Amino acid sequence: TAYNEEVENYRSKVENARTELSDLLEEVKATRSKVSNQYFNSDLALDINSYFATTNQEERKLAIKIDLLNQVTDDSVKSALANQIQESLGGTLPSEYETEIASLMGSVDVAASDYATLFSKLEEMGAMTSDEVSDYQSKLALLGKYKSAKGVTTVSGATYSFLTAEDAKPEQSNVISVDVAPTSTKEDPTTVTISNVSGGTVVFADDNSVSKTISKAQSLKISYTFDSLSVGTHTITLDLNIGDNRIPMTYTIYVTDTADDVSLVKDDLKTIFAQLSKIDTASAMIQTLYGEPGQTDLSQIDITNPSANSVANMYGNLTFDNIDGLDVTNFKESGVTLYTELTNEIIELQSTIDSLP
Amino acid sequence: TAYNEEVENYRSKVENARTELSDLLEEVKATRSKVSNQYFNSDLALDINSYFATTNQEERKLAIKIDLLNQVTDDSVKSALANQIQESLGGTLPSEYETEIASLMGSVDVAASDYATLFSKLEEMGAMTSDEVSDYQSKLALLGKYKSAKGVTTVSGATYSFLTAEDAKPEQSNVISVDVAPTSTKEDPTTVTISNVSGGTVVFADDNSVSKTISKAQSLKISYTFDSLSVGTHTITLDLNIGDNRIPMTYTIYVTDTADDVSLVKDDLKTIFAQLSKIDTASAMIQTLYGEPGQTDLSQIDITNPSANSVANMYGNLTFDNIDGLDVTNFKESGVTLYTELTNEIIELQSTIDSLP
């Protein structure tokens, strides 16, 4: 007729629309799952049943949002945001820093023991304090850690003139010869003597005597000996008496103590300045790249495994933790809005599927 | 009857379902827009009409994906990913670096001009090369830039003993007195002379003469004068002749040149080492934090506006550009999948709405 002749097609199409919507529903459930994995790091699969009875749509969205915020932790969102920048996290220290350090170290000797004698002389002469020697030994220890951690070629050995510089050594004894003659064949005996000696011993060489008597022209040898060869100026003074003649005489020697001082300044100092400068520069570079910020105890600085806050580890490095909290909040808010609207849409799609005869 | 008595409710419900789905459609369009803004940085609003005729569903998704990939640039996705970590980008250099530098600089004098005299003396004595003086002036210039950029209190002034150290100056002339007596009232005249002089001038004080004749016991004054006061040992030798007596005589003076050398080593060197060490350490720290990696021309290092690759600018700093390309690709892939599935769902929802009598 008309109720079963062509009307059955009407109901069959309605039922075909009902089955189409049931398939669309599952597709919407699957994309809601992918949204949950992106933003929340898991698949919450929020159960729509709890909100299905609420007819007010904004009242329904509010209820869904409140349930999601009490169910998703900020940590989960932080992990989900990190997953979106998995490769970008972490930095790379440019290799030019190590290249410059190795250049400096190429002409430096890092074996601190080889400095003992040098540091000992400089400390005996008052030219370097004990703390300066302690610090250079710490910096040298650090350069060793770096050289051993990387593959740094360095130099080995050095000689310093001023470590073997010797002052002249003047002769402590000496001898002289004088020509004496008697005072006029009545050439009577004439007594020659050595009087008023100071600064040493002055005596005639053959007798060890200080008084002689002659009666003919003659030569006499006099031995004089300074009292010591200690540092400073030494002077002998005496009177040589020939008859009524008194001739004052004096001899001087200078024991200097400035050989090492003079050699240090003119031979070695310029080389010592350069080497200490290289040690200071390279050690400070290493300290600044591999030390915890503000670290002054160089023994604590680790090279092979840099510390968390070191420049070597933080250069161009966004860490999981330093991901700002506001970004996690806004990321959480984006996911909740998307998830809420998709859940609300599933509810409406189920409602129309249900309410469809 | 039955076709218009209760059947009209059937068609009205079908039409009410049709209007519900038309409202759901717009809600789906709005969330698809929010998905496009998150991942693509704009609202593409892809037009479904082009794919509406394709019945194969996977063939439809493929066509949509291919259209989206030829429409979204990787740069747009990069900007969208950056927007998700807007606050996390950028680092903060810990303040401990500046704190350590300022501590070092607190006992350093950064005015390089105040070093001129010191550097000039050290260079005259061969104790420092000309390049060492040029480098310390560069490092001092850099410490000035840092002190002026930050607010670093420093020290001003210093005195060095060895810059005014003077050697003793011995007397170039001197006089002596001898007691002469004639050789025996037949006390005949006796001639006293000065012979075989070298090293200076030796003459009797009153006559400027070298020969005298006496006839009675007497005192004579002799003036001797070294030839110069130049550096080194000077010795005068002569023979004093009294009758047939010949008494050799000698005098010596020592002009030393080691006053500044001795003072540098024992007074000032230890202070100079410490100050040069502080200059080297702090300058190297500054160089390593504010220089482009591997920069050795210290004049080019800018403090107030660090350079892009400086440690000061790259510490804990993920830049927009260093966002890895793979992350942008995977982010683009997530958005395209979500957008594709939402577009495909809109097509199916419109299809069932259309095919619904």
Ligand SMILES: [Cl-]
């Ligand atoms: Cl450390």
Ligand SMILES: [Cl-]
């Ligand atoms: Cl630079």
